[PDB]
Amino acid sequence: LHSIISSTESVQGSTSKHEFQAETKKLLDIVARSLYSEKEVFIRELISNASDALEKLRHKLVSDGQALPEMEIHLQTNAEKGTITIQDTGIGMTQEELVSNLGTIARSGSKAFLDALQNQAEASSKIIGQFGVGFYSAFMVADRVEVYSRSAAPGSLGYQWLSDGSGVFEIAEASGVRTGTKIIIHLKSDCKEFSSEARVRDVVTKYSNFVSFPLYLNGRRMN
Ligand SMILES: COc1cc(C(F)(F)F)ccc1Cn1ncc2c(Cl)nc(N)nc21
Asked: Which residues are reported to carry the modification Phosphothreonine?
């Protein structure tokens, strides 16, 4: 087995409170309405984000003239705790991205996204992934979401990011955060299936060969 996910991060800073941007809640809701019928697709959306983060790290390291480190995507199910967890060893998120990225689209304009979603030229899941709101799909299956991230940028601190998706999110400095990003999803009552290894394996194996970095599920290689 090869696992990197462990509950070892520790809160080491006081909590700063932030309220959702105006049109953030509306986008959360529309992503949920759009993907309910195939709600298992949140896993693919998050794997895609992880893959993107690893590509961003690659380009940083190429310009830095440095070797590629362990570049991996990990899934972990906990049936007892009713969670699914995804962790990647990519570029991570800065403090300002953790504070601002949730409301990025709406502020920058959601019209292009909403128009594309309406046209249905591609799968709704692809449109959502492409316009950079795949993280929104975490909330549609979650009672609450727990993020740990630390950017590869020099001087970046590690952070814990918490939200129930209701209108507020909380950020605190954390120790023991590995460069990259871990998302812990505490699953909704109708979404418990995704805390089952068998179920998640059945979902992921349908596209795991399309993932360009080593993909692990509960310590087992999927590709
Ligand atoms: C936790 O991923 C996110 C959190 C938030 C926020 F709301 F917590 F800020 C907004 C957007 C995203 C998606 N996202 N953005 C950068 C990024 C990187 Cl570097 N890695 C991964 N795996 N996902 C990413």
From this structure: 104
Give this entry's resolution in angstroms.
Answer: 1.7
Q: Where are the domains of the chain?
A: 1-223
Q: Is 35 touching ligand 1 by the criterion CB < 6 Å?
A: no
161 lines ligand 1 (CB under 6 A): yes
Token look-up 């309910």 returns 36
Judge if the beta carbon of residue 147 lies within 6 A of ligand 1: yes
CA 82 to CA 98: how far, in whole Å?
Answer: 25
Q: How far is the CA of 50 from the centre of ligand 1 (A)?
A: 9
Q: Is the CB of 93 under 6 A from ligand 1?
A: yes
Our measurement of the distance from residue 151's CA atom to the centroid of its chain's CA atoms, rounded to an integer in Å, reads: 14
CATH for 1-223 (3.40.710.10, 3.30.565.10, 3.20.20.70, 3.50.50.60): 3.30.565.10
Q: Rounded CA gap, 109 and 15, in Å?
A: 29
Known binding-site residue numbers for ATP: 49, 88, 101, 135
User: Beta strand pairing status for 73-78 and 83-88?
Assistant: antiparallel
